[PDB]
Design an enzyme around this catalytic site. Structure first.
Site, PDB file in Angstrom:
ATOM      1  CG  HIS A  51     -21.244  36.578 -74.240  1.00 48.68           C
ATOM      2  ND1 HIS A  51     -20.193  37.391 -74.620  1.00 48.68           N
ATOM      3  CD2 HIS A  51     -21.340  36.590 -72.889  1.00 48.68           C
ATOM      4  CE1 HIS A  51     -19.710  37.912 -73.498  1.00 48.68           C
ATOM      5  NE2 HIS A  51     -20.368  37.454 -72.427  1.00 48.68           N
ATOM      6  N   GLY A  52     -20.285  33.150 -73.768  1.00 47.50           N
ATOM      7  CA  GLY A  52     -20.148  32.382 -72.543  1.00 47.50           C
ATOM      8  C   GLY A  52     -19.641  33.243 -71.415  1.00 47.50           C
ATOM      9  CB  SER A  53     -20.496  34.900 -68.848  1.00 44.83           C
ATOM     10  OG  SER A  53     -19.825  35.797 -67.985  1.00 44.83           O
ATOM     11  N   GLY A  83     -26.366  39.786 -63.205  1.00 42.57           N
ATOM     12  CA  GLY A  83     -26.009  41.082 -63.765  1.00 42.57           C
ATOM     13  C   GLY A  83     -26.162  41.170 -65.265  1.00 42.57           C
ATOM     14  NE  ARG A  95     -23.345  45.709 -66.591  1.00 41.84           N
ATOM     15  CZ  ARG A  95     -23.117  45.941 -65.300  1.00 41.84           C
ATOM     16  NH1 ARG A  95     -23.162  47.181 -64.821  1.00 41.84           N
ATOM     17  NH2 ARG A  95     -22.815  44.940 -64.484  1.00 41.84           N
ATOM     18  CB  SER A 140     -19.098  31.020 -76.402  1.00 43.69           C
ATOM     19  OG  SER A 140     -18.939  32.156 -77.236  1.00 43.69           O
ATOM     20  CE1 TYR A 174     -12.318  33.447 -72.800  1.00 43.61           C
ATOM     21  CE2 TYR A 174     -13.430  32.666 -74.770  1.00 43.61           C
ATOM     22  CZ  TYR A 174     -12.315  33.209 -74.162  1.00 43.61           C
ATOM     23  OH  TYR A 174     -11.205  33.521 -74.903  1.00 43.61           O
ATOM     24  CD  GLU A 229     -11.415  36.956 -80.453  1.00 43.97           C
ATOM     25  OE1 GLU A 229     -11.209  37.923 -79.685  1.00 43.97           O
ATOM     26  OE2 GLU A 229     -10.967  35.804 -80.244  1.00 43.97           O
TER      27      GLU A 229
END
Ligand SMILES: C[C@]1(c2nc3cccc(C(N)=O)c3[nH]2)CCCN1
Length: 351
Positions: free
Chosen positions: A202-204, A211, A218, A244, A247, A328
């Protein structure tokens, strides 16, 4: 006093709580920092622009006139001040125009979470600010030894799942952290024994990690439009590290990013080849598997602490007419994820 935390941990805490990085993300988003400053950012304002963004999407795909579209586009820029000076704001007449804004508001909400953690709480100059901020995350962060064990699986997963179509950059694992969010294992209890539990990526943006580490991964709020996502509102994951990594929104002016590894309880997967803006899963299903053209070698699937790691090199999946180049995975219940590791990556651009 000085922090007794390891330097990789300290650099992680500095990186995620950077007020100037939060400001930098907001300028990238064309936000007027005079009318909508960082400290005057609110959840109810973001929720309100989401509702108007749902109304814009409701009219774009309902074949509305460009004049009916305009009124709704303008209403969105009223609630979210954009810095365009005395010029008319860019028109939001297409579907991608709207998804970009629904993504901006998801990232604005987590910037408010980060800033509210920082601005809230107590002031004590005798304590190391790095030690203070770390405690706010309510997460146990430990450095994983390079000569281990779990670090060899993780490094194999990164080295083996970088796609050929994401060849503009290479990745280097700087630090590997084992993370343990307080109360997460207990939230995970109904899913700890479920079938199809996989270690996924999971990339962000780095601006969302205060957060993510504090609240966990979330889903978007009810105000966000479900059409603003390929498989509706859920938590998205990849088996290919580079999918990922893309992202992380890292660049030549910011080549350091953060990526998560989580144990995702997929169970009965609802396989899909094309976009499906679902609200809930069909009866009996626990996740959506978006089938991609390429997939990691299933014979190379490894087990790390009872969880399956799809670290094989990419091969053809045998999937016919599919919208996806790679897989995905989407879960629609936050309790179905257990965040295990957090990696700091250096993106080496060839561009
Ligand atoms: C487009 C979207 C997304 N699709 C993904 C597919 C695999 C991995 C990730 C990730 N973040 O690592 C994805 N994120 C939908 C939700 C917000 N971003």
């Amino acid at each position: 006093s000085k922090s007794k935390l390891p330097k990789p941990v300290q650099d992680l805490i500095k990186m995620i709580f950077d007020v100037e990085s939060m400001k930098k993300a907001m300028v990238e988003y064309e936000i007027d920092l005079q009318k909508m400053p960082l400290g005057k950012l609110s959840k109810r304002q973001i929720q309100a622009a989401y509702s108007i963004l749902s109304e814009v999407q409701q009219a774009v795909s309902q074949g509305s006139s460009d004049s009916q579209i305009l009124d709704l586009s303008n209403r969105f820029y009223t609630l979210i001040p954009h810095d365009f000076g005395m010029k008319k704001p860019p028109l939001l007449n297409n579907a991608d125009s709207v998804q970009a804004k629904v993504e901006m508001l998801d990232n604005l909400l987590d910037i408010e979470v980060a800033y509210s953690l920082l601005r809230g709480g107590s002031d004590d100059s005798s304590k190391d600010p790095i030690d203070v901020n770390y405690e706010k995350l309510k997460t146990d962060i430990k450095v994983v030894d390079r000569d281990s064990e779990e670090a060899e699986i993780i490094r194999k997963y990164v080295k083996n799942t970088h796609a050929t179509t994401h060849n503009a950059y290479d990745l280097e694992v700087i630090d590997i952290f084992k993370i343990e969010r307080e109360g997460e294992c207990q939230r995970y209890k109904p899913f700890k024994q479920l079938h199809n539990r996989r270690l996924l990526w999971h990339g962000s943006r780095t601006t969302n990690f205060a957060g993510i580490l504090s609240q966990g991964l979330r889903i978007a709020p009810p105000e966000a439009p479900v059409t603003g996502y390929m498989f509706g509102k859920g938590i998205y994951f990849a088996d290919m590290v580079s999918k990922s990594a893309n992202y992380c929104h890292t660049s030549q002016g910011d080549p350091i990013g953060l990526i998560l590894l989580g144990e995702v309880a997929l169970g009965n997967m609802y396989e899909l080849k094309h976009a499906s803006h679902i609200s809930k899963l069909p009866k009996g299903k626990h996740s959506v598997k978006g089938l991609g053209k390429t997939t990691p070698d299933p014979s190379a699937n490894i087990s790390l602490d009872g969880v399956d790691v799809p670290l094989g090199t990419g091969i053809s999946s045998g999937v016919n007419d599919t919208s996806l180049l790679y897989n995905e995975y989407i879960v629609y219940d936050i309790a179905q994820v257990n965040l295990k590791y957090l990696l700091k990556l250096k993106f080496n651009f060839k561009t």
